[PDB]
């Protein structure tokens, strides 16, 4: 399909990889005894390996000639769960972190001892700001509009 890849559900090398891993795990399982915790752990390993391979097969995942899932990150929504949705999730979380950090910096920057409140965090104010970051996309595009997001010329510059 895309880039010459093929779905992993029809990739023979993918099933060969699964079979080889299961065979190695079973051979390891053979050298232990009865329902002893080592055998239980190896059986859990086998079950998890089978579940992971089955989930990857039924996941709209494209496999190359090596039988490994390749990620299609050109931007198409068909393979949108590989990069685009995790990209949105990370952008949300990281914007949350950056927004709460910036808000805390600007909030304790207007107190008597701004530097003290950076090594000794005001946990009440920190908790107040941190749970308010869920609106960071909206807060950012409400502070940029008001001109409160960017400094203009009070920023310092070197000699040249």
């Amino acid at each position: 399909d895309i880039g010459g890849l093929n779905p992993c559900k029809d990739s023979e090398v993918f099933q060969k990889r699964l079979a080889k891993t299961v065979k190695k795990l079973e051979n390891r399982l053979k050298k232990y005894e009865e329902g002893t915790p080592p055998q239980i752990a190896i059986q859990q390993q086998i079950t998890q390996t089978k579940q992971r391979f089955t989930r990857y097969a039924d996941s709209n995942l494209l496999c190359g000639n090596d039988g490994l899932p390749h990620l299609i990150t050109d931007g198409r929504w068909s393979h949108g769960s590989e990069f685009l949705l995790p990209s949105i999730l990370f952008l949300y979380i990281s914007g949350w972190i950056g927004w709460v950090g910036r808000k805390y910096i600007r909030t304790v920057g207007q107190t008597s001892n701004p530097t003290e409140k950076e090594i000794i965090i005001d946990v009440p104010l920190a908790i107040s700001i941190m749970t308010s970051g869920f609106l960071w996309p909206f807060a950012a595009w409400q502070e940029f509009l008001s001109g409160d997001l960017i400094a203009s010329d009070e920023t310092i510059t070197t000699s040249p």
Binding site: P38, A41, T115, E116, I150
Partner: protein
């Protein structure tokens, strides 16, 4: 109102916990730049600059020692708890030669359960190379319940040491005169601590370890072995194994000590069953050590008209060549903690290296000589600790010279006379270092270039120009002839390394005569050269710590400073700290070469398997003799060859070793950013980053500053040491566990 302690000196309060940097006069005002954060941790234990009173520094040091001992006790309790709960110690007891010791199981997350190896005995976990199983077996511990109780005792002891530290800083802190009773302290540490510890351990060995281990070697399973207390309440369970307890303590008090030859032997060699030292020999050794140390503890005058005064001993040791001699040394060592730390750390690291040597040379634990990973790990770890401690001793000698050295109090004594001719010492040490390096390494390079040019008869090899270590071979011959000639009451040599028979346990070689040829000559001279260069750097740091021809007032700049400026052609790293930094680098080099020599020589010419007919086949096959004489040989037949197990560990239970190999390479390369660069570039880059932050109104109030020059060097050396030592750690462990 005791005469030794002050009651309730410091109030137990949490107020100062909420004021970081309260100890320092400069840091107490609060952070203004990020340099304050780093200065906070760099001055935490520098008690000299926190108080102007030696008494307060001594009390802080005493409580810090208690905290450290509590940490050590907690670590030991954790080790015993892991042995009790997450180990295959019981399975290893019944099959020491076929079960690999494991005492740490790994949770099944993110696929990391592959690290749980097939250590044997129906167990999965990480193979343990600390030799705790062999130590516990030598202690007579035959059940995991005993390990649990030892862990509980360790936890109780750790809490006790924590309470002792709190008590002796906040409730009853000793006075300076108590700390300065070096005669009483030496008497107690020599008699009580050392001698009575040896005596108590000899008692434990004789009454618990001797019978239990004898029964274990006889084939008695641990379940039918009597509980250790039964060997004390019943004089018949121990009198069957050693038929001399039937006479009781009467032979001891009647001076008929020959009766106790059953369990106080002098045999030498190794136990043929376990491959370790005879535990009867060990008990006799500890008894003799106890008596010697108890006797040695009655030397210094403490509270009666009896004993020696160290001041009078030192002041009487003058000479024509040494002026006032040792006059003033007693005042130096009773008023400066740094001098005591220097001496103790240097001798402590040297002792650690000696311990490392004597460990593999004469394996003291049952079934530890045939556990090659344990032997390699123990040697390498102890040599590393020794090198670090020696560098620390040099560092604190330099610190004493900078800070606690008084010129007036040391007029024409040994310290003064050493400083007065420091040039001669350093110049001759420089010449010796150049001579040794030229010779050792250039003989290596000559061998390499002769081999590369197809001239095999021009090498410094055994089948070529030969450099036989005749002096060491003479000593080896003297030791193998000692039993019956110079040690007439010995039955076997102290170690089979000096010569004798091949000692094998379960077809695995425990010890064997270590032949010394031209390959050992070159590597020994390499060791001497590296040690001499490290000594050169550290001694130049100590002697030139106060002044020099460059900076006549270097003592006024302190122990730790980056430079005096770009003038005089450049005055980088003139400190004494910058000498403990370079000396750390050279100690890493020396110890790395030492452990490489040990690993290759043991794998190639000691360790291996013995055929039923007596044919010895080694791990590598004797390639050390002919291929360790060239740098290409070290690169190929040792590094490239034995790195195969590390690089091929992916997908196996040793994959963590490959991951740590790669990560240690990454950290070592990361160090070079700090070692090669300078502070100005990073400060000017932080300037633009701060511009961006200010543009987005997110510049922190604590102004971000690049790490200071000294801190940049410290970070570089710490990362370099961590990366190199971790790379060697992963390489050694994967190689010696795979094969």
């Amino acid at each position: 109102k005791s005469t030794i302690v002050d009651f309730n000196p410091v109030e137990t309060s949490f107020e100062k916990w909420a004021k970081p940097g309260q100890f320092s006069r400069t840091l107490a005002k609060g952070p203004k730049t990020t340099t304050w954060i780093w200065n906070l941790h760099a001055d935490a234990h520098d008690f000299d600059i926190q108080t102007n009173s030696l008494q307060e520094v001594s009390r802080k040091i005493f409580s810090a020692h208690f905290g450290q001992l509590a940490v050590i006790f907690l670590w030991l309790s954790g080790m015993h708890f892991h042995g009790a709960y997450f180990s295959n110690y019981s399975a290893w007891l019944t099959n020491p030669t076929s079960t690999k010791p494991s005492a740490q199981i790994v949770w099944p997350i993110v696929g990391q359960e592959v690290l749980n190896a097939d250590v044997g005995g129906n167990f999965q976990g990480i193979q343990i190379t600390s030799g705790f199983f062999q130590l516990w077996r030598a202690e007579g511990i035959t059940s995991e319940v005993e390990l649990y109780w030892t862990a509980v005792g360790g936890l109780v002891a750790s809490f006790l040491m924590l309470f002792a530290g709190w008590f002796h800083y906040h409730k009853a802190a000793p006075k300076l005169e108590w700390f300065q009773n070096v005669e009483s302290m030496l008497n107690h540490h020599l008699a009580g601590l050392l001698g009575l510890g040896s005596l108590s351990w000899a008692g434990h060995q004789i009454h618990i370890a001797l019978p239990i281990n004898k029964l274990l070697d006889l084939g008695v399973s641990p379940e039918e072995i009597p509980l250790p207390y039964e060997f004390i309440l019943n004089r018949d369970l121990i009198a069957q194994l050693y038929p001399s307890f039937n006479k009781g303590l009467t032979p001891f008090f009647t001076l008929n000590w020959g009766e106790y030859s059953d369990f106080l032997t002098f045999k030498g060699g190794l136990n043929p069953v376990t491959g370790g030292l005879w535990l009867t020999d060990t008990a006799h050794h500890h008894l003799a050590i106890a008596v010697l140390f108890i006797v040695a503890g009655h030397m210094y005058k403490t509270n009666w008209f009896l004993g020696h005064s160290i001041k009078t001993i030192l002041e009487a040791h003058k000479g024509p060549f040494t002026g006032e001699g040792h006059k003033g040394l007693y005042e130096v060592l009773t008023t400066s903690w740094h001098a005591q730390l220097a001496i103790n750390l240097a001798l402590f690291g040297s002792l650690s290296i000696i311990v490392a040597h004597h460990m593999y040379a004469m394996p003291p634990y049952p079934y530890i000589a045939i556990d090659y990973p344990t032997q390699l790990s123990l040697f390498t770890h102890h040599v590393w600790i020794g090198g670090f401690c020696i560098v620390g001793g040099a560092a604190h000698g330099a610190i004493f010279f900078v800070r606690d050295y008084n010129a007036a109090n040391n007029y024409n004594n040994l310290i003064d006379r050493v400083i007065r001719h420091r040039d001669a010492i350093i110049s001759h040490l420089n010449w010796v270092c150049i001579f040794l390096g030229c010779h050792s390494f250039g003989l290596y390079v000559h061998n390499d270039t002769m081999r590369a040019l197809g001239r095999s008869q021009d090498l410094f090899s055994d089948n070529a120009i030969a450099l036989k270590p005749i002096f060491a071979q003479f000593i080896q011959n003297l030791h193998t002839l000692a039993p019956g000639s110079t040690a007439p009451n010995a039955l076997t040599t102290v170690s089979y390394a000096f010569g004798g028979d091949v000692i094998s346990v379960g077809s695995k070689i425990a010890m064997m005569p270590i032949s010394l040829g031209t390959a050992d000559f070159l590597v020994h001279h390499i060791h001497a050269f590296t040690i001499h260069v490290t000594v050169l750097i550290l001694l130049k740091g100590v002697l030139y710590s106060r002044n020099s021809r460059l900076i006549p007032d270097k003592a006024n700049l302190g122990f730790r400073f980056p430079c005096d400026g770009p003038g005089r052609g450049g005055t980088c790293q003139v400190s004494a700290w910058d000498h403990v930094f370079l000396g750390l680098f050279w100690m890493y080099n020396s110890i790395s070469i030492v452990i490489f020599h040990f690993s290759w020589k043991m794998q190639s010419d000691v360790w291996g398997t013995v055929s039923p007919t007596g044919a010895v086949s080694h791990i590598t096959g004797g390639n050390f003799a002919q291929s360790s004489i060239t740098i290409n040989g070290w690169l190929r037949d040792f590094l490239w060859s034995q790195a195969a197990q590390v690089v091929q560990s992916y997908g196996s239970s040793l994959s963590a070793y490959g991951l740590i190999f790669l990560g240690a390479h990454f950290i070592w390369a990361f160090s070079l950013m700090f070692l090669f660069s300078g502070r100005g570039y990073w400060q000017e880059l932080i300037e633009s980053i701060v511009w961006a932050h200010n543009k987005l109104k997110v510049a922190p109030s604590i102004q971000p500053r690049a790490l200071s020059i000294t801190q940049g060097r410290a970070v570089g050396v710490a990362h370099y040491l961590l990366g190199g030592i971790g790379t060697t750690w992963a390489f050694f462990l994967a190689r010696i566990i795979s094969v």
